[PDB]
Subunit: 342 residues, 3 copies
Amino acid sequence: AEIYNKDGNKLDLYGKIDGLHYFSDDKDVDGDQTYMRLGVKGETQINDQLTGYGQWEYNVQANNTESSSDQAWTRLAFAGLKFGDAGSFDYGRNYGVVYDVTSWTDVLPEFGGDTYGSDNFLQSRANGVATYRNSDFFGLVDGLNFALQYQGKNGSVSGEGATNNGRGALKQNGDGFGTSVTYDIFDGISAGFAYANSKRTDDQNQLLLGEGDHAETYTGGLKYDANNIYLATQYTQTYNATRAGSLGFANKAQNFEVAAQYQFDFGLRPSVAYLQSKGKDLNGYGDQDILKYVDVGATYYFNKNMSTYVDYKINLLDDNSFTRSAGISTDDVVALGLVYQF
Amino acid sequence: AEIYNKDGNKLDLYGKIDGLHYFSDDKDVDGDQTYMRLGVKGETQINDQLTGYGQWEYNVQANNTESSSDQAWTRLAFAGLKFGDAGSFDYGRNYGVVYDVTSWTDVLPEFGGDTYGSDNFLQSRANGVATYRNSDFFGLVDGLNFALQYQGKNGSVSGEGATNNGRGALKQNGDGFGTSVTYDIFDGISAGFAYANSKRTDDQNQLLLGEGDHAETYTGGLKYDANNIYLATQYTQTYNATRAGSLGFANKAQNFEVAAQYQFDFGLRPSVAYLQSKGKDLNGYGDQDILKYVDVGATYYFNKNMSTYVDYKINLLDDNSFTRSAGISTDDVVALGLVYQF
Amino acid sequence: AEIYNKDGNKLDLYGKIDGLHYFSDDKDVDGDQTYMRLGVKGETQINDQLTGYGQWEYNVQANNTESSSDQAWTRLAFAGLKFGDAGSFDYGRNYGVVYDVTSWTDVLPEFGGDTYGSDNFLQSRANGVATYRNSDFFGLVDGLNFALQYQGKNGSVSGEGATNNGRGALKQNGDGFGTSVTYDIFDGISAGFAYANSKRTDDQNQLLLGEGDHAETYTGGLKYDANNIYLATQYTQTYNATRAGSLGFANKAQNFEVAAQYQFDFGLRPSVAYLQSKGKDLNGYGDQDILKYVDVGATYYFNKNMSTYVDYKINLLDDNSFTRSAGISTDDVVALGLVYQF
Ligand SMILES: CCCCCCCCCCCC
Ligand SMILES: CCCCCCCCCCCC
Ligand SMILES: CCCCCCCCCCCC
Ligand SMILES: CCCCCCCCCCCC
Ligand SMILES: CCCCCCCCCCCC
Ligand SMILES: CCCCCCCCCCCC
Ligand SMILES: CCCCCCCCCCCC
Ligand SMILES: CCCCCCCCCCCC
């Protein structure tokens, strides 16, 4: 909601209040899930070419008691400059360039978008990331955009890995970089490829699974969007990058996602999708499946401010020594929600 | 404060900044008490009959250091639909229907409203609560309203009680339901009754006091409001529902509250009230008093945005083995405050 | 940004999003430093003479993971009344009157302002502080202002020191008071003096260094501001008030700060400053330096909403047994930032 516009400067106070409930045999996901988001977006005019911006986004959980702890966190926070034609530059806590392509399939009612995690190198939201983007290849080629980003090291809490912003091994990282490229081929058809590479840290190599100096990703995608039809698919291959439960990293893995949906003029929007993550050579566990399920659900829009939804996750995983040790869930889940947004 | 209204949608950013100070011989309540609340309220027009809404409210303490922890929590968070005549429906973190009646006496300057607590079954604010309300009995009877709500189970943090939203025994609960009914008899005279009942959990029965399968409440109230006079009283009887300090639950107890106040045209609003909670059969402690005091204070309004107040709690409890073991306070308290609200 | 003004009441929603990065050999300060501030300011008209106000300010860090803890805190929170001529009165979490003078030198791009800390008696931000201020000596003398404040005791977490708002020894305090006086001599020349005195607590005297019943400060300052020139200096002498690393308090110490800067009409604002804190009689460590460095940097303004900066701290301290035991840093630091504010 735009709440201020005057003298070259403008503001946006936005967010949502989601009433969620989960139904599952898995006791650590079953129950109330209500939460809420709050955010701010700014834009200031400097010249006829230069223009500054900034954005912050917060997540506040509302399913526990008034005495509970660690209930809220920050998802995004950054500042940048926009140069009209030559592109844009920003820095802070933001999305890794890999998401530029993998977001094409992150469009389910509740689930989905989980063959990666956050603070997982440059695959999703991350700390201290400098980003440069260019739009229609300067004004020349239409619909051809690309980006280049660098991320500094986020070490341990003490010892030598250490950096002021210390976290645990599964969320650490060394210096790295990545780039993406997308193109609008013709009518509602787009294609894209993105690559990333970064240094691993000492603590990471002293973990149960995974061994290497570098962490890498190669990802390509395709998408169709027109005439109330949405069709998208993504494929990505990783080397010492995707987490294997709580045990460590997969030496090599292959991820695949597919989504399809239709938009009825009267509000209903049914959806069907499928996804899986397969790991190879897991230090004595051989070849295992890390994630695998079929999702079926639908969402109803009252208007651009209110909606309801139902989502149904059908788990295809088999209970075994691996899933048990890694802490990976194998049960089904059903979500039901009511949400208001401004 | 309404900060946005345009195209069928409207917003409210509200709250307050309270400068509080407590004077007491009880060392764990004596001292600075400054805090602040922030909230948001929305409303979107859908049809000539349908209309969606949402509300969030946060509490942020300001009496400790910039390095202290667990200083802020969420009080309310929910979304609903309003059907014009047929009523309304909402879900999330909200008030239990019992408060529909007991709030009649929760009108003191600082103290009062404490024969119950929060996250105490359906007596005050609680997690994951679905609520349906109907206004003038459809349009037919004027001033006759009622409500019906259901609350899902909020288990332990692990083991089998467990649910994703795990908390400790004194704040757990099983599936339950409750209803309330209020009626405007004539000139500034209202009456109301509310009943609730819910399942208890394993962990709750392994506590020092209290034993049972169900937790129940029966509450009735009366109120007079007109000609600058305010008179209200509430009576409620519980079974395995009211907490007995930190030891467990009272097998049966009786709660009573009375408040009276006058509003001078020039701003001053003096107040006098009295309340007590009496417990029966406390597993070897017999019959004891759980709470008991007389309150006298007054508040001054500069306008609808600023005010000052003083409150004086006169504790009638006697120091003994019970109050000592349960952790119940027996000293007096004096509050003094300055508050600004928007 | 003023987002509401109507019917005698007005609101301000303000803040900033700062993209920061530190470069240092000191591993506990090196790395990402991104954070963000959010605040609210209100003002309500009561009479032709009376007028109420309120302010809150929050700090939210954005350089760690979505699972990290203790990432946000409250800096200010208070309410007051303004009496037109006779002055003003407010209470809550606010600045100590000593800052009225020492702020004259707290104007560096990133560093500086550190010969004191927060929750350090009445030298910076503190809990439960009642403040009275008077402007032009009632309307009589122009540019001559003064203030008088009292701060209640902030004890320990338990035992007898205890108060509801319990914190650790280095941040405790007893009852105290302080006053300041400033005067505008002539053209862009001001001078000021401020004094404070408060009782120490038991826990504070059982610390490794420092011994006394009272904590005191005597501070005087001078400033020149005109024709794009800024010149300021501050001197203050303490008795059992300035912290000596993590070991305790200095029995007596002397602090000195100097800053100088020039404002080019086209946006650039270079700056040079120097500061040091010298401690005397440190229970067997003799006379030591507690802080000492030279700072050189500059900031560029795109407009009243966007800016960039670089800051360079040149540490003059020598590595020794003292600095090592107290936990005092001896390396250099370089900051680089991009910031948007509203
Ligand atoms: C058997 C019908 C029961 C009807 C109960 C109506 C409750 C109205 C309460 C009015 C209190 C003054
Ligand atoms: C006009 C006064 C109406 C008060 C209603 C009292 C109802 C008492 C019900 C007792 C049920 C046990
Ligand atoms: C549904 C209406 C029930 C009316 C019961 C009135 C009981 C009043 C008791 C007041 C106790 C302080
Ligand atoms: C006009 C007030 C009528 C009060 C009626 C009271 C009915 C019995 C209430 C019993 C409460 C324990
Ligand atoms: C005219 C005032 C009527 C007040 C009624 C109080 C009812 C108290 C009920 C106590 C039941 C044990
Ligand atoms: C208007 C005030 C009504 C007061 C009714 C007295 C009820 C006393 C209840 C005592 C419960 C043990
Ligand atoms: C409604 C307020 C009445 C206050 C009367 C106080 C009487 C104190 C009696 C104490 C008995 C233990
Ligand atoms: C206006 C006078 C109201 C009197 C109400 C008396 C209630 C006293 C309660 C004492 C319980 C022991």
